[PDB]
Design a protein around this nucleic acid. Sequence first.
DNA 1: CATCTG
DNA 2: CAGATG
Length: 327
Amino acid sequence: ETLNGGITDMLTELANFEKNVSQAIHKYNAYRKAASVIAKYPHKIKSGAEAKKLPGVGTKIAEKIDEFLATGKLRKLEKIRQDDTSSSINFLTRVSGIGPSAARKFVDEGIKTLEDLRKNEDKLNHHQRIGLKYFGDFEKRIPREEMLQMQDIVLNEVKKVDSEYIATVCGSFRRGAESSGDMDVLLTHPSFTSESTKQPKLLHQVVEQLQKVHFITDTLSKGETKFMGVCQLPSKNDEKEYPHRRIDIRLIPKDQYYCGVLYFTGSDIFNKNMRAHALEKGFTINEYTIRPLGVTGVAGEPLPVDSEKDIFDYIQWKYREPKDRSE
DNA sequence: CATCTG
DNA sequence: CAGATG
Ligand code: NA
Ligand code: NA
């Protein structure tokens, strides 16, 4: 957590560059397990050889460690941090919908900046467009102060279109968290389930409404159960208008709402721990269900959920308020 | 994993 | 359809 700090840190710094600049998924994958292991390691690694002794730790890495422990730097790391080429890739990518794969092709055509982008707006798809349009707006985090106002609005709407809908704004929001990164509502409906053969309107009907009132300003992608777009709070009495923000909407069969809802509320940690224990309790869990675990190795058959309560209970536990689902 | 491009 | 993004 701090005794192998730099090691795992330069490790990760490399892994990144493998995957992002080079297409080097293998190496990327390499740099990664090591950074994980020296990470879980208890000693203050003092040498490459000490290190090498570890699974994951080969020789290439062991060498970089020696050089690093030897000098405050690493050259390869120093060379990469300059390379206008390697830089551009970390940049472009920042753009919504510009992945690495893309980041390359652009840079090669020589699209290196926002300016470059704008100039060639023609070559980017719709997604990358919105993405470039709201680049600032998208980096800013969301205040819970706006978070509430947002949720207020969405919640009123859905109810409006159908009393039978169920929505929830998961995430950090859900945990307290003074600020979010983007919004995600989890949708459901009595009339939506595992077996029930669809109801698409179910998603679109609400989407529609969102725009009717003009909250949702653009669509990133819409499908039959998942929606990805842009939104905005109305600007009061003209002088102060809100930044454009990211939002996601998604359909769930009323039969797996809770698990999703649980799951999606996080944190990741509260998840595994819940998960690990649920294993003891002779259970199994994922984003969708809870299954009575068999002995013969594994077993299934979905247990019933009516609130995040039912699940907790299943595994015999303390029902947590979202606030305390940290870890 | 679900949507999108093409 | 493969491949990419989130
Ligand atoms: Na991106
Ligand atoms: Na292939």
